[PDB]
């Protein structure tokens, strides 16, 4: 439960500007004037290159079939399976 609880704190501090709060007004002014005139950070959510994503998904779909054989093979070693055979 603690390890699951760990994440959102790191999230909230990752999003926060760097100043201690007597100087956080220096951060608030620039962001407020940038949102006055007219997006996550790219370390937690990024839209990859299409050409890159094709290679990544092909690597993934390779690895799945390597998982499945070990899954069904160790499923063949339960004793109820042996009695049925």
């Amino acid at each position: 439960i603690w390890k699951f609880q760990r994440h959102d704190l790191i999230e909230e501090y990752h999003g926060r500007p760097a100043a201690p709060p007597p100087f956080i007004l220096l951060s608030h002014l620039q962001l407020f004037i940038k949102r006055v005139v007219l997006k996550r950070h790219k370390q937690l959510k990024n839209k990859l290159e299409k050409n890159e994503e094709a290679a990544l998904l092909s690597w993934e779909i390779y690895l799945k079939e390597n998982y499945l054989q070990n899954r069904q093979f160790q499923q063949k070693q339960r004793p109820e399976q042996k009695i049925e055979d």
Partner: protein, 89 residues
């Protein structure tokens, strides 16, 4: 040395499964030399694909399953670009 049908080749999925694991598994351990016809069609395409994805999935492993293809010089499509009189390095 694997040989098969080039232009008009059809296979059931069970036959396809052996190329992915049986040929690659017995090629990759012994340090084989897969020699085949050099063509993009049919069975040679199946060997060409099934040896490529192993090299990607190897995760920067040392060594590559070396593959040598032999085809006739006559039935090549764009070979006029290949003839360079000097050493085409």
């Amino acid at each position: 040395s694997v040989t098969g049908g080039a232009k008009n080749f059809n296979m059931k999925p069970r036959l396809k499964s052996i190329f992915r694991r049986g040929l690659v598994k017995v090629a990759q351990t012994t340090g084989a030399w897969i020699i085949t016809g050099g063509s993009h069609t049919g069975v040679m395409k199946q060997v060409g694909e099934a040896v490529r994805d192993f090299s990607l999935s190897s995760s920067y492993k040392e060594g590559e399953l070396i593959t040598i293809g032999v085809a006739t010089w006559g039935t090549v499509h764009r070979r006029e670009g290949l003839i360079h009189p000097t050493g085409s390095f």
